[PDB]
């Protein structure tokens, strides 16, 4: 799965050669970046419960019909709202997973793989989840270069949504 | 499948479905901190990669001398070049294992079906792991030795560099 | 071998690869239909040859 | 659509002229007996002599040929067919049993025709044989 | 493109043989349904303008927020409602096209090919168009076996939507 | 790939006799009931995508650890994996009702299914709880008469449900 | 094996899609003709023993040397005449098989597959069997559209012979 | 691959209007004239191998140097080469009468055939002397008043012969 | 085309290596026999006109119906007998061609390639031509090792006929 | 493995046909050549011990540093000189093997396959072995056509060295 340490391996393995100094450079880059990436993981893990209920009530604001229309798909009764905090709470897990991995791999393999297939069948509009993630990237309270770090992977999930 | 130290502590954490704990991140912070040493270890092995293989072949064949004598499976010339074409593939994937930091990329290539071909071909399987140990005796001698480098304990890397060779010898013998 | 007749001729200039065994003759046409033409132009560019002309048929 | 599941690869040891080439293509795929009289296609033979259709393109027709489908695709199981398909074009039996199984689900969704197209598309297959060269044992 | 007369050809062409009685069986069979299929084409062409504005105001009922939310994608102002009758009016064209062709070919090539790519980018939820097509299949006023005929291709566009 | 028409040929070839008159009276009833068979088939495929998710509102709600963290339907590719081949059951059951004999279904759909389902690690028995939930929704649609001439297709309904029971037996 | 119901399946299976109305339409066509095809099966099964010995003595007329020349291949010996009614009697079986199947499949798989290989080795001239089949298509006594039905498959075996 | 049904769609898509009622009355005659096409088509394919050798003898008896030593139909695989694709004319003309439009004919026999026939050195004009001899035998079989019932096939016969004339124009 | 000098080339060309002593040895073998093969060419060229009319009247003996039955395929009138000496006279050409080439190449490329296709279409039974070639191999009057050499290629055409 | 009798087989096996006269001719050539090739085998086997120590002391002449420089590869002490007569004595074995086989096969499979891989790793310069083989081809004392026979395979090992 996609990781800068893995991407050095799978490039050098398909050539059948050893690890050159070029394969090594990708690994070297991760340590300096990875020091600021683990700063972004603790910023999201400590503020996790504020961010989930901060998000799942922000999507109810811009889409008020989602709490009103009676359907299995919509979040009309409590069972949808129970599956609301599950789904949005699944996003902050994988975002924090792809932070400490350094790559988009866990985001590529757990979340966005086959997302167009599932949202068409269950009629979950992807405009809902992109509205929650814009709330997360503006309200995580992170600062410095770590604020850039979470901001890529959130925005990478945004582009894969649309 | 290709896994890491960074990705394997994700993959079991996905199977339990929880957020990553703070003591796992303090564990990975030591991996980044101990990360610089890992790059250096790989660099010295790959720069002395071709020098290890023949110096192991100066004992892999001298200790069991019927192998290159007429009748042995290292006798003819293509055959002899066959156990240098894949003596180095042990080093090609052990160096991938030290780079990734976990032996999960080692066990798909040198450990997966290697013990099956080595009775299908007719080669002595146990006569490989006498010399992969002779590689490990020369690999940790080069990695351990310090010339013009700052000195820090490399025991964690070295003990478990030698664990990758012992896994490389166990699934062949 | 294309479900429908939508075939475009392709002319590559100079194909670099293992030149004796893999590409014995450069500057030859490849006759690929419409379905794989997305795939085919990525195959030519991996070797490094450049397209001259693309003529339908 | 969805990316293939990662499967472990087992270690492997392997890892007048115009008329003859046509026979060679037929021989690997049909194992001599199958060509018979009926299986042979006039159009494929003409294209090779004509050279309008490439050899890589030539094989796809044979793979997707109706005669081939009845003989191998219908009788054999999807899992067996994936293993069966590998010997003629790739020339190598699959290294990992799990990998063969992974290929089978994909074969069912796109059909027999879909699976054959995929093999040509894969980077390993094209590189190993080449468009000009007929498929050979590895 | 996919047609029962075409499907007899492309099957017999890849086999390099002539037209057997098995390819020639379909043509005889096709005419009997094609006699009732052209009945369904005149039923939709004559009632075309009633069915489009019958549909584009039915989708505004079940989704009232689509006329209220200000977005390029939504049908808030008149430009969306101008593109409303264009899009739903495009559907009744291709449904009438696949009626007289007998196959799903024109439906497969003009409408549903790459529909998951376009609805993700422009954020057009496919739950909108399936609500219009349920209004068409219930309000075309067609009867008999021709009422079955339009009902397959409408429902075939429904399954390709979701 | 066999049929009702071709299987009564294939055993008749193995005994090497001409086809008897009561076999042709049997096939004459097969042609006679052919129109009814076609109608049932079109209703399944037109409600094909509506069946699968409505089975997935119960396949996962009844065994809720499967999508909870740890289950084999947990992550998103894994979830799309049991919708990419929940429909392949419907893709080949509808081929079986069209052919009229389950020999098409056996060769591809269930020949190697029970072997992969212990190689992957998926619960094999947790498939056949929901293929039964497909059959409860498939024969509910195929029997209901909406805008259709009154007719009796009861025989098809029982041996339509026999194809689902064969589809559940070789997985469980 | 080749059947209009099978040809609908193998076309739709290689695309990986469901049964459209274009595969379904093909099946409908087969039924109209299958009602007249089973008429042709009973016409050949009831007159089976008249047609075989009507044929194997008609080929002896046009080829009188076949009963005179002493050869293994030749039918001059009783053993050949025993293998005469076997071979010509095999033809009326497969013709009646391809009648009730509706396609040329059983004719394609049992009879004509590899027929050029076998007739070259055993020196059986294919001009013999085509002379028997012309006797069958003129003396079956069938009438109407069913007389057309047996006349295709007999003539399809003729073209595969030469 | 186009049709009569699909080509009147394809120009109607290019103008972007609904299909008019007089186009549907045109297609209603095509369905009505549809049965005749099948009858004509089945007689050609059943006498398909009988046409080629009968057409072929004239093709070689009229220009007798072609099989005499020196001609391009001289040796035995060269002779089997102009029977392996004399029938491909019949293989695609019968596809054209089935589809009812010559747009499937012009991609296979008319597209690059006049280019190979110059490079090859085989005479191109010596093909279209015998494709006319096929048309003289094809419309003699299709229009024979034997069996079935009397009907007007004149329209079909003239535009069956138009497909042979298109098949002779792009080779000569 | 197939020749022992050619077969040394095409074997060494597909390996991409030079001419070894193993390809060289094969060439020498062809040359040595070739001294006795050209003896067989003059024995057939000088007796050519005796052998053709010796053969085409021997086939009329064993098959007397071939001069009696009215059919183009048959040699009833003079036009068949004109095409009789053409066809049998074509055989002695290619047999003499494959003699001096040393291989079966000219026999493989001019005569027997696609012979099963042509004899099925024109209904020429291959039992006719094998009866003429048995007359040639017994009446060429050749002796010694050249008699052995001439026979192989005649008998090679016999096996390709049947 | 490569032999003129084998090369006749593998050529005829990949075509799927019998042994023609062209495949056979190569075998015939070997016997005349093979009569003079076995003359060359006894000339090298009887003079074997003179030729090995004649060679391994001729290479010490042109390369005097090979007995002086202390290295594992170099023949400084007695261990190298023990491996000297082993290696050069291995060459006269395979040369005598490829003599009686008639082809370069045993030379191709035992000696020169992968020789560029081994000489790069152990730093054995191939200019050493080519100097010994020039001593063998000039001092075997063979005469006549047999003197040509050993002279090809010695020179074939020379070209594969460089
Ligand atoms: C470990 C088994 C042995 C060992 C290692 C060791 N390394 C260092 C320090 C550095 N190593 C590197 C290496 C790299 N930096 C890069 O960017 C790359 C490319 C990917 C490499 C190869 C560097 C640069 C440092 C520090 C910075 C510098 O050298 O300029 C030390 C001491 C310093 C530290 O802790 O980092 C040690 C001990 N030493 C042994 O004795 C072991 C046998
Ligand atoms: C591990 C990563 C992962 C995620 C995130 C995931 C989401 C996911 N959410 C689903 C349904 C759902 N998703 C929601 C969530 C929402 N709907 C709303 O109304 C709100 C706008 C929104 C929450 C903010 C609801 C209410 C359902 C149930 C809908 C139904 O049953 O039709 C479904 C289909 C049925 C299911 O098993 O429960 C999946 C697969 N699956 C995954 O594998
Ligand atoms: C048997 C028929 C045949 C031939 C001849 C052949 C030759 C051939 N030479 C090639 C390249 C080449 N050939 C040469 C040759 C030379 N450059 C110079 O300056 C020298 C004067 C000269 C050698 C004396 C070079 C330099 C290249 C590499 C060109 C490049 O890399 O761009 C290539 C493609 C590149 C490759 O794969 O190496 C081919 C196909 N291929 C064939 O199939
Ligand atoms: C990436 C994992 C992997 C491995 C390891 C692998 C091995 C492998 N080793 C082979 C042969 C061989 N391997 C040896 C090896 C040895 N002889 C000795 O004496 C030593 C004990 C030993 C080496 C240390 C020999 C002599 C042959 C040739 C045997 C023969 O041809 O008879 C072959 C057949 C020829 C070839 O190289 O293609 C394969 C495929 N393939 C793989 O994909
Ligand atoms: C020939 C068959 C055919 C159809 C039907 C089709 C539809 C189609 N409608 C589109 C946009 C659109 N579609 C609509 C329609 C709607 N949005 C709403 O709010 C309403 C609910 C609904 C109408 C009832 C609107 C308003 C846009 C513009 C959205 C945007 O620009 O983001 C787009 C993307 C942009 C474009 O080119 O205009 C396509 C491709 N394309 C095709 O090729
Ligand atoms: C044409 C007949 C046919 C069928 C039906 C078939 C099924 C099949 N499903 C598979 C995996 C799978 N099957 C499922 C399905 C499920 N797992 C769950 O968690 C749910 C309980 C259940 C669905 C209700 C999933 C999620 C995978 C992926 C598992 C993995 O990748 O390890 C695999 C192995 C990998 C693959 O190619 O995708 C096969 C062969 N193959 C066939 O050829
Ligand atoms: C392939 C395209 C195609 C379809 C779909 C088709 C269906 C079809 N179903 C028919 C009849 C029928 N279909 C049904 C079916 C049923 N009635 C029930 O109450 C049951 C629940 C159900 C079976 C489960 C019945 C009862 C009839 C009555 C007429 C008959 O026996 O055919 C007929 C008779 C002729 C007509 O309706 O005009 C048609 C056309 N024909 C076609 O050409
Ligand atoms: C199920 C469909 C089927 C048929 C019809 C069939 C025919 C068939 N007939 C054969 C021989 C034969 N066929 C015949 C028949 C005839 N020869 C004559 O002289 C008469 C003119 C003519 C009969 C009217 C004879 C006499 C033999 C034996 C010839 C020999 O042994 O050389 C042979 C080769 C040897 C054999 O197994 O007996 C086959 C394969 N095989 C099949 O699988
Ligand atoms: C007047 C008597 C006569 C005929 C009939 C004739 C035909 C003829 N067609 C040829 C070639 C050919 N003919 C075709 C035709 C086709 N291939 C396809 O796949 C297409 C479907 C189809 C065209 C629609 C092709 C592809 C060739 C290849 C060789 C060439 O370009 O001529 C050749 C080349 C020489 C040879 O085959 O020996 C001959 C002789 N020559 C004659 O003297
Ligand atoms: C000599 C000029 C001439 C022609 C050509 C002719 C054909 C002809 N074919 C007819 C019927 C027909 N023709 C067919 C033929 C077939 N249907 C299939 O699906 C099969 C594939 C195919 C046979 C292989 C059928 C099924 C009918 C139905 C009506 C009948 O039984 O006659 C009829 C009935 C009356 C009519 O159609 O108006 C005509 C006129 N009549 C003429 O006077
Ligand atoms: C260069 C190698 C070569 C040969 C041998 C050859 C033979 C050959 N003989 C033919 C016809 C013929 N072959 C014969 C010969 C015979 N029929 C009999 O009745 C006798 C038993 C027998 C002679 C002993 C006759 C009479 C025809 C004319 C038959 C017809 O026109 O239908 C034909 C088809 C028409 C033609 O062009 O004349 C070919 C191709 N062609 C070749 O390219
Ligand atoms: C059957 C054909 C065959 C040959 C000929 C062969 C030679 C061969 N000689 C070798 C080493 C050697 N070769 C030599 C020979 C020489 N070095 C010198 O200094 C002298 C100049 C020269 C002799 C005249 C020596 C001394 C070694 C040992 C070098 C070392 O151990 O590094 C080696 C590598 C190690 C070994 O197994 O002993 C091979 C494979 N192998 C084969 O399979």
């Amino acid at each position: 799965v996609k990781t800068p340490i893995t991407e050095a391996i799978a490039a050098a393995d398909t050539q059948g050669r050893f690890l050159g100094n070029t394969e090594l450079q990708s690994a070297r880059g991760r340590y300096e970046r990875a020091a600021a990436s683990l700063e972004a993981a603790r910023g999201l893990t400590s503020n996790a419960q504020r961010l989930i209920d901060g998000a799942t009530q922000a999507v109810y604001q811009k889409f008020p019909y989602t709490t009103q229309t009676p359907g299995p798909q919509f979040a009309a009764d409590s069972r949808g709202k129970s599956k609301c905090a599950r789904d949005v709470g699944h996003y902050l897990r994988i975002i924090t997973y792809s932070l400490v991995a350094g790559g988009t791999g866990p985001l590529d393999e757990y979340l966005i793989a086959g997302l167009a297939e599932i949202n068409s069948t269950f009629d979950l509009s992807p405009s809902w989840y992109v509205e929650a993630l814009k709330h997360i990237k503006a309200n995580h309270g992170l600062s410095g270069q770590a604020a850039n770090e979470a901001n890529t992977y959130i925005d990478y999930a945004i582009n894969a949504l649309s | 499948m290709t896994l890491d130290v960074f990705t394997k502590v994700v993959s079991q954490a996905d199977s339990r479905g929880e957020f990553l704990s703070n003591e796992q991140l303090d564990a990975l912070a030591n991996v980044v901190k101990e990360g610089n040493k890992r790059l250096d270890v790989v660099n010295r092995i790959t720069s002395n990669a071709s020098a290890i293989v023949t110096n192991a072949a100066r004992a892999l064949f001298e200790e069991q001398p019927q192998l290159i004598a007429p009748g042995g499976n290292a006798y003819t010339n293509r055959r002899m070049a066959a156990c240098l074409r894949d003596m180095e593939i042990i080093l090609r994937y052990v160096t991938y294992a030290i780079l990734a930091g976990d032996a999960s990329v080692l066990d798909d290539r040198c450990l997966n079906g290697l013990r099956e071909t080595y009775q299908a071909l007719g080669t002595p399987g146990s006569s490989v792991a006498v010399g992969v140990q002779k590689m490990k005796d020369a690999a940790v001698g080069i990695a351990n030795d310090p010339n013009g480098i700052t000195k820090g304990d490399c025991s964690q890397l070295i003990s478990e560099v030698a664990s990758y060779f012992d896994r490389a010898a166990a699934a062949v013998g | 071998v294309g479900e429908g007749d939508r075939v475009y001729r392709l002319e590559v200039t100079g194909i670099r690869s293992p030149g004796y065994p893999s590409v014995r003759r450069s500057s030859t046409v490849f006759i690929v239909p419409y379905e794989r033409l997305s795939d085919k132009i990525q195959q030519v560019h991996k070797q490094g040859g450049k397209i001259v002309s693309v003529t339908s048929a | 659509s969805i990316p293939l599941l990662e499967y472990a690869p087992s270690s492997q040891n392997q890892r007048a002229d115009v008329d003859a080439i046509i026979w060679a293509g037929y021989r690997q795929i049909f194992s001599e007996h199958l060509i018979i009289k009926s299986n042979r296609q006039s159009f494929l033979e003409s294209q090779l002599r004509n050279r309008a259709i490439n050899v890589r393109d030539f094989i796809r027709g044979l793979g997707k040929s109706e005669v081939y489908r009845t003989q191998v695709a219908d009788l054999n199981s999807n899992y067996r067919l994936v293993d069966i398909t590998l010997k003629r074009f790739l020339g190598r039996a699959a290294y990992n049993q799990d990998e063969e199984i992974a290929w089978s689900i994909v074969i069912g969704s796109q059909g027999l025709h879909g699976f054959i197209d995929a093999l040509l598309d894969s980077d390993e297959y094209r590189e190993n044989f080449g468009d000009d060269i007929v498929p050979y044992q590895r």
Side-chain angles (χ1 to χ4, degrees), chain A, chain B, chain C, chain D:
Chain A
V1 349
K2 198 175 268 293
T3 305
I5 320 196
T6 292
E7 226 28 77
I9 288 172
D13 173 46
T14 197
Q15 267 157 355
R17 68 180 207 88
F18 279 90
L19 291 166
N21 202 34
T22 172
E23 292 62 355
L24 294 175
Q25 285 194 11
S26 294
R28 195 299 193 281
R30 218 299 184 190
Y31 304 115
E32 276 69 13
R33 168 93 292 179
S37 173
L38 301 192
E39 183 46 63
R42 312 191 182 193
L44 293 187
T45 307
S46 306
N47 296 339
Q49 208 43 65
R50 297 173 193 157
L51 266 156
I52 292 169
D53 333 2
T56 182
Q57 276 166 7
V59 57
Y60 295 161
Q61 224 200 359
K62 196 158 166 67
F63 307 96
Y65 76 107
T66 31
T67 74
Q68 307 265 23
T69 337
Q73 66 176 7
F74 291 99
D77 70 275
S78 56
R79 194 196 66 91
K81 304 170 188 177
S82 72
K83 277 197 171 149
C84 277
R86 196 180 56 85
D87 270 353
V88 129
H90 276 314
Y91 270 63
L92 273 182
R93 286 180 56 249
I94 313 297
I95 289 304
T96 32
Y97 286 166
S98 173
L99 277 180
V100 323
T104 62
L107 199 54
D108 228 314
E109 196 194 347
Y110 296 145
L111 191 99
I112 58 177
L115 198 140
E117 215 16 82
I118 195 192
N119 288 15
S120 79
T121 49
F122 290 127
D123 285 59
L124 300 172
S125 114
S127 144
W128 297 335
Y129 293 113
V130 71
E131 223 347 278
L133 294 182
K134 293 185 192 177
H135 175 82
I136 295 182
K137 64 178 274 169
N139 274 24
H140 44 55
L142 216 55
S143 84
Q145 174 47 42
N148 193 296
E149 207 74 82
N151 228 358
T152 70
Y153 292 123
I154 288 174
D155 254 15
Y156 180 76
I158 285 198
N159 300 326
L161 274 168
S162 328
Chain B
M1 190 182 174
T2 51
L3 286 197
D4 266 300
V5 216
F6 294 88
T7 328
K8 186 181 267 168
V9 311
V10 167
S11 128
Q12 44 162 330
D14 174 65
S15 230
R16 305 162 197 158
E18 54 194 324
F19 291 86
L20 274 182
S21 140
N22 296 330
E23 64 70 299
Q24 311 203 39
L25 300 160
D26 275 58
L28 291 181
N30 256 303
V31 183
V32 146
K33 221 82 206 174
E34 171 190 4
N36 288 345
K37 286 177 172 52
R38 180 172 304 173
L39 303 176
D40 188 354
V41 174
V42 166
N43 184 319
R44 292 176 157 194
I45 307 296
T46 42
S47 24
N48 298 121
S50 174
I52 277 172
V53 183
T54 112
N55 277 342
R58 300 199 183 283
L60 230 140
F61 303 104
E62 196 259 358
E63 207 54 69
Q64 317 197 2
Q66 120 272 8
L67 287 178
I68 100 165
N73 212 355
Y75 162 64
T76 165
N77 239 25
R78 181 199 174 287
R79 292 184 185 177
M80 169 70 214
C83 59
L84 295 185
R85 81 175 131 81
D86 55 59
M87 202 69 58
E88 62 143 20
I89 301 184
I90 299 278
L91 269 186
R92 260 190 62 242
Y93 284 111
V94 148
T95 44
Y96 294 170
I98 308 164
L99 174 70
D102 163 33
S104 146
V105 78
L106 183 61
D107 97 289
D108 325 314
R109 287 98 151 88
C110 332
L111 308 186
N112 216 334
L114 193 61
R115 213 207 198 172
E116 219 59 56
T117 70
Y118 272 17
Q119 297 145 19
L121 289 159
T123 172
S126 74
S127 275
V128 177
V130 55
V132 188
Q133 296 296 321
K134 296 176 170 268
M135 266 176 155
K136 144 182 172 180
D137 278 8
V140 312
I142 295 179
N144 196 7
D145 190 24
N147 289 332
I149 302 166
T150 25
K151 302 176 182 179
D153 280 349
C154 226
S155 66
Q156 306 182 13
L157 283 185
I158 286 182
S159 298
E160 74 184 330
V161 176
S163 104
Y164 292 150
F165 281 87
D166 281 38
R167 287 178 39 88
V172 193
Chain C
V1 328
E3 171 199 45
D5 185 297
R6 288 287 299 279
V7 179
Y8 302 101
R9 180 190 180 98
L10 294 178
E11 278 95 312
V12 196
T13 55
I15 299 180
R16 209 155 311 169
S17 187
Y20 177 61
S22 192
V23 63
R24 195 187 179 169
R25 176 184 302 167
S26 86
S27 74
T28 190
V29 307
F30 299 127
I31 292 187
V32 304
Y34 188 109
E35 279 301 13
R36 69 202 63 164
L37 195 139
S38 63
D39 183 87
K40 190 55 189 168
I41 297 190
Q42 296 193 358
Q43 282 187 21
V44 166
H45 289 330
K46 182 57 133 43
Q47 289 159 348
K50 320 197 151 193
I51 297 180
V52 187
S53 94
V54 173
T55 304
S56 156
Chain D
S1 60
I2 314 183
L4 287 169
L5 167 59
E6 292 177 350
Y7 35 83
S10 61
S11 58
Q12 189 45 196
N13 302 358
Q14 304 173 353
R15 179 187 62 182
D17 305 12
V18 182
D19 302 358
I21 297 182
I22 297 179
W23 272 90
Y26 265 115
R27 197 172 73 90
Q28 187 63 180
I29 299 186
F30 301 127
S31 80
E32 293 179 354
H33 303 280
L34 286 176
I35 323 178
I36 333 178
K37 174 281 300 181
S38 62
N39 298 10
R40 276 171 155 321
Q41 304 179 15
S42 63
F43 45 97
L44 289 182
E45 303 178 19
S46 66
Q47 299 160 344
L48 286 180
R49 304 304 181 38
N50 186 356
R51 281 194 170 188
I53 314 173
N54 298 353
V55 176
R56 175 190 56 177
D57 289 345
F58 169 83
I59 270 192
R60 288 200 172 193
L62 289 178
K64 299 189 177 183
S65 65
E66 180 282 349
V67 40
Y68 165 99
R69 181 194 199 100
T70 59
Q71 302 303 16
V72 178
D74 315 28
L75 310 174
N76 290 4
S77 71
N78 303 346
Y79 295 109
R80 199 290 191 37
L81 282 186
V82 167
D83 183 352
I84 307 176
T85 63
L86 294 173
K87 297 297 297 183
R88 296 182 183 174
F89 311 71
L90 291 179
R92 35 155 265 75
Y95 305 118
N96 166 22
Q97 300 180 0
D98 295 356
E99 176 179 342
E100 306 179 1
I101 295 179
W103 281 92
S104 71
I105 176 185
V106 177
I107 292 176
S109 55
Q110 289 186 340
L112 296 180
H113 315 262
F115 169 65
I116 285 188
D117 306 349
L119 294 179
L120 182 292
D121 282 353
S122 63
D123 298 27
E124 293 189 7
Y125 167 88
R126 36 163 281 192
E127 292 176 333
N128 311 345
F129 309 64
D131 311 346
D132 292 356
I133 316 178
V134 196
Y136 57 90
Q137 312 157 351
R138 289 186 48 187

